[PDB]
Scaffold this active site. Structure first.
Site, PDB file in Angstrom:
ATOM      1  N   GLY A   9     -47.734 -29.111 -16.463  1.00  0.00           N
ATOM      2  CA  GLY A   9     -46.710 -29.103 -17.492  1.00  0.00           C
ATOM      3  C   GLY A   9     -45.474 -29.937 -17.233  1.00  0.00           C
ATOM      4  O   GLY A   9     -44.457 -29.756 -17.904  1.00  0.00           O
ATOM      5  N   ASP A 116     -41.698 -27.219 -27.192  1.00  0.00           N
ATOM      6  CA  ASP A 116     -40.729 -27.200 -26.109  1.00  0.00           C
ATOM      7  C   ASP A 116     -39.860 -28.441 -26.150  1.00  0.00           C
ATOM      8  O   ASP A 116     -40.312 -29.512 -26.568  1.00  0.00           O
ATOM      9  CB  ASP A 116     -41.401 -27.132 -24.742  1.00  0.00           C
ATOM     10  CG  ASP A 116     -42.033 -25.797 -24.473  1.00  0.00           C
ATOM     11  OD1 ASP A 116     -43.066 -25.495 -25.097  1.00  0.00           O
ATOM     12  OD2 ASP A 116     -41.499 -25.055 -23.630  1.00  0.00           O
ATOM     13  N   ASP A 117     -38.607 -28.261 -25.704  1.00  0.00           N
ATOM     14  CA  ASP A 117     -37.645 -29.331 -25.407  1.00  0.00           C
ATOM     15  C   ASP A 117     -37.334 -30.188 -26.632  1.00  0.00           C
ATOM     16  O   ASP A 117     -37.157 -31.403 -26.535  1.00  0.00           O
ATOM     17  CB  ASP A 117     -38.117 -30.200 -24.238  1.00  0.00           C
ATOM     18  CG  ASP A 117     -38.181 -29.436 -22.930  1.00  0.00           C
ATOM     19  OD1 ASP A 117     -39.116 -28.631 -22.749  1.00  0.00           O
ATOM     20  OD2 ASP A 117     -37.295 -29.646 -22.079  1.00  0.00           O
ATOM     21  N   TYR A 161     -37.512 -20.632 -25.178  1.00  0.00           N
ATOM     22  CA  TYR A 161     -38.482 -20.071 -24.255  1.00  0.00           C
ATOM     23  C   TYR A 161     -37.848 -19.509 -22.994  1.00  0.00           C
ATOM     24  O   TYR A 161     -38.573 -19.123 -22.079  1.00  0.00           O
ATOM     25  CB  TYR A 161     -39.540 -21.117 -23.890  1.00  0.00           C
ATOM     26  CG  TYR A 161     -39.022 -22.441 -23.359  1.00  0.00           C
ATOM     27  CD1 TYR A 161     -38.741 -23.497 -24.215  1.00  0.00           C
ATOM     28  CD2 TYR A 161     -38.859 -22.648 -21.998  1.00  0.00           C
ATOM     29  CE1 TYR A 161     -38.280 -24.706 -23.733  1.00  0.00           C
ATOM     30  CE2 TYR A 161     -38.406 -23.852 -21.504  1.00  0.00           C
ATOM     31  CZ  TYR A 161     -38.119 -24.875 -22.378  1.00  0.00           C
ATOM     32  OH  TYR A 161     -37.668 -26.075 -21.892  1.00  0.00           O
ATOM     33  N   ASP A 227     -40.167 -31.927 -11.987  1.00  0.00           N
ATOM     34  CA  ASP A 227     -39.907 -33.021 -12.912  1.00  0.00           C
ATOM     35  C   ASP A 227     -38.430 -33.300 -13.133  1.00  0.00           C
ATOM     36  O   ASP A 227     -38.082 -34.443 -13.433  1.00  0.00           O
ATOM     37  CB  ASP A 227     -40.575 -32.745 -14.256  1.00  0.00           C
ATOM     38  CG  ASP A 227     -40.378 -31.328 -14.723  1.00  0.00           C
ATOM     39  OD1 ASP A 227     -39.254 -30.981 -15.137  1.00  0.00           O
ATOM     40  OD2 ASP A 227     -41.357 -30.560 -14.680  1.00  0.00           O
TER      41      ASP A 227
END
Lengths: 449, 449
Positions: A9, A116-117, A161, A227
């Site tokens: 991920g 997400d994001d 989340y 990351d």
């Protein structure tokens, strides 16, 4: 049914299919049972999701799913369309249906869709048609769930989340209320913790989010995620999570480092943590230090498979390596001991008196012994015969060697400069001002604690 | 004639064979003619050099040599025997002879002996047969050179190749005198510069080496090599070299970055330094800026298939990661603007604060240009070039966003609190790990007595 496995991920450099087949071999030896494919920088997954695979991409995905079904690992193809999607337009819905239909033919049974994001603002037609972001997303998830004939394990990650991303709280947020009300009960949700990178996921936060979604969530766990900071690496055990969270959860899916060969400990300690308990309602039947020791012992046996043919690495070298690169919010015992010894040595560096000179030179000698230990660790690790593990972490051990050499030089300079015997710190080592390459310059021109 | 090419001579992950064939295609496209194969973290070249090749990598080396001969590039198989070599032992010489002879049976015609970082002397019977260490090195180099029946291009790299490595001075060192006298001509030497990173090789240092080696040295370039830190790359020009060095040299070999896809600009600007400027002998004319513009234009043509990357993004990218010593004009402009703002920080929100806000507006505009460069570079079609340099652009993106938030706090210093942002990132969650913490605790110029 519990979804204990590994989610790919992270951002940047997705793994190759041989690495994922080795991962499926590794999970089957450790009695884990899931894998969630969602690499954020694979261009057929996130940046372009309408684009369909080629014949060779379909072939390598088909043999990836076949290798997963061979190794009893539930492959979950996730898909993240949220960067550019009109939920009100049914053409985007039908294109998503076509992509999920084409990945249905490759042998996939489990699916997921990830949000997400992304920014919370929607399109003009999305704001015109639907009331809020969560209603449109839960309608898309319910439509995809009905379109695929309600699969056994379907996963949905919301935009809020984690605890910092949701406002004003985890219970007064309208987003989690809409998600908990308007969702089909067979769809498991994803969650991270109080932050995107959680020091701890306590029991009460899990219970209040299980109140607000009316289901037990699956924790996407970015504990060893790499990351956000590519100068860092994490080799610590699976700590910060109590063993009583297993009956209150539906799954634990860990998001490991971007380098595949650095992930032996981060998955093996999760396997030991899942082996602690499986049912029933400072930790009982799980010690993170013992799981770390078992992970490093099995990793040393992984190193010894080619051993030295085509000095070797010892277990103490691996323990020093794991203590140097431990956690996003912790360091090892050896790393913190080296930190407090260097902070002691630079505290009374300016004035050192007698017995004070004796204890200063003895702790400086202990610091030089630890510097020689990290030099021997890097030299024995670079002499290993498993080349892939060396190439996956060569930048990090090279950076810690290149820093610790100059730190050893400055401790030798301080041992010279305790007495008046001329010299200079510039004359010992050249004071370079270009680490990072215009990133470390801005980093040192920014305030710390 | 002139050995203008690329030495793959760094620490780290060595390149795979297909990108070496791509490198050979680029060297054929840019009228370079050489390739010095010496990857120092290879288990058959530096360490375990005595081991014969396996029955599956011999064909890989054969196809690499044949792919070199297809594009008319001289494959120089260098070998690094200097880890545990006994020079006086003839069985070690026989093992070295068989090891080079099996590469001679692979179609390779040029060979090189490499003696980096072996400046420790011989021991026991080895140190007394030979009068000096350089005498031992040139005697076994002459024995290998006459064993192969004098190949056309043979490269002897000493351990005293740096200007600070030669002791004392350059002319007064016994090593360079022993190398310049007792070694046969036709074995060209490798000289990095007056420093190991070689900011400027002048004419006069080359004359002071050529008067003691009685030949012309093939210059090693660690001008774009990032093997000493691996935390930045170098997209600058071939600055720091006069155009008149070509008649006074025998070759120029460039050691590029460990990431292969970031080496387009450095090898191309070396090509515009050589093939466009003084191929003939002439015992100022090369413009590094126009060479950088041509390299970025050809690299933009490489970047196409569509992520709408423009040439201003690549000029900004090359200015962000420019040189080991220098930075770009835009990068130095951003650094001087940020240090001016952090020097002239407003207490509260007449003449000073208005100019401060104007410069802060321009600073946040170019920070947004950095963000646009990253988000356009993430959308490129060729994914491998993105995957090679993702860590560096990610690091400069996150550091630039935190610096922009710090400028936003500095605009409202009396109003806001807890510095830049209280988001559990005051050490940026221990950025850099222990390497970053010990680097920030190193007194370069802040705690510098």
């Amino acid at each position: 049914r519990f979804l204990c496995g590994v989610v790919e991920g992270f951002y940047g450099r997705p793994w190759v299919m041989e690495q994922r087949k080795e991962l499926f071999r590794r999970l089957q030896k450790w009695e884990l049972n899931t894998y969630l494919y969602a690499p954020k920088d694979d261009y057929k997954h996130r940046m372009f999701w309408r684009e369909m695979y080629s014949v060779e991409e379909a072939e390598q995905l088909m043999t990836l799913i076949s290798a997963a079904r061979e190794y009893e690992i539930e492959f979950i193809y996730a898909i993240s369309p949220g960067l550019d999607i009109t939920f009100s337009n049914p053409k985007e819905v039908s294109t998503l249906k076509r992509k999920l239909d084409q990945v249905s033919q490759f042998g996939c049974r489990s699916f997921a869709l990830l949000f997400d994001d992304i920014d919370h603002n929607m399109c003009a037609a999305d704001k015109e048609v639907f009331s809020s972001f969560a209603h449109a997303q839960v309608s898309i998830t319910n439509e995809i769930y009905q379109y695929l004939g309600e699969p056994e394990t379907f996963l949905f990650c919301p935009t809020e989340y984690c605890g910092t991303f949701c406002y004003p709280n985890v219970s007064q947020s309208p987003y989690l209320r809409t998600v908990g009300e308007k969702l089909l009960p067979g769809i498991e949700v994803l969650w991270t913790g109080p932050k995107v990178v959680s020091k701890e996921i306590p029991v009460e936060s899990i219970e209040e989010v299980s109140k607000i979604i009316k289901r037990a969530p699956v924790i996407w766990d970015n504990i060893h995620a790499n990351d956000y900071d590519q100068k860092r690496l994490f080799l610590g055990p699976y700590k910060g999570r109590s063993t009583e969270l297993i009956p209150r959860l539906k799954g634990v899916l860990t998001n490991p480092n971007c380098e595949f060969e650095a992930n032996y400990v981060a998955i093996h300690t999760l396997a030991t943590w899942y082996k602690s308990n499986m049912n029933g309602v400072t930790d009982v039947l799980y010690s993170p230090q013992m799981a770390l020791k078992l992970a490093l012992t099995e990793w040393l046996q992984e190193f010894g498979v080619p051993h030295q043919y085509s000095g070797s690495v010892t277990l103490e070298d691996l323990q020093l390596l794991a203590d140097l690169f431990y956690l996003p919010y912790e360091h090892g015992p050896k790393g913190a001991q080296m930190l407090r010894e260097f902070q002691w040595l630079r505290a009374n560096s300016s004035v050192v008196s007698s017995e004070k000179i004796e204890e200063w030179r003895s702790r400086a000698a202990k610091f030089e012994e630890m510097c020689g230990l990290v030099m021997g660790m890097f030299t024995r690790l670079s002499n290993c015969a498993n080349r892939t593990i060396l190439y996956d972490m060569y930048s990090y051990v090279w950076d810690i060697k290149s820093i610790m050499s100059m730190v050893k030089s400055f401790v030798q300079w301080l041992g010279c400069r305790s007495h008046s015997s001329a010299q200079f710190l510039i004359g010992d080592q050249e004071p370079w001002a270009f680490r990072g390459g215009l990133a470390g310059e801005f980093q040192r021109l920014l305030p710390i604690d």
